[PDB]
């Protein structure tokens, strides 16, 4: 329990971990989805509209 309990928040507050060391923390991340995570601080809008603009542009090309 002492080891495992409440091991989520720390990734989002290094100032409350020892040495502000990321490498101590747990960061939850999909093995498959880690292939597409490349651009740091890309505005949520940019990413979510980027995907939607992809899907429209291809769909329009293929069925209209």
């Amino acid at each position: 329990i002492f080891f495992k309990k409440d091991s989520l928040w720390q990734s989002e507050h290094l100032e409350a971990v020892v040495d502000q060391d990321v490498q101590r923390t747990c960061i939850l991340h999909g093995p498959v989805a880690a292939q597409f995570t490349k651009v740091i601080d890309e505005p949520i809008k940019s990413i979510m509209d980027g995907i939607h603009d992809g899907h429209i542009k291809k769909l329009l090309h293929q069925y209209y």
Binding site: I1, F3, K4, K5, V22, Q23, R24, T25, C26, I27, L28, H29, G30, P31, A34, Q35
Partner: protein, 64 residues
Amino acid sequence: TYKKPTGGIVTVRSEMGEPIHKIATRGVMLWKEFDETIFNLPKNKLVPTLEAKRDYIISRLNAD
């Protein structure tokens, strides 16, 4: 990911035994090591293992 870190992510056991994909950081590698060595052990044989490895466990916890 179940056996070894695969593309930098690894599977570790939760508190209830549910798997979780996290980044293979030193903290999560220790977490996996203690899932394979300590936490898996039957309740009776837990306590003798904790004194047996006390100095090892502490040096890891304070490091990683």
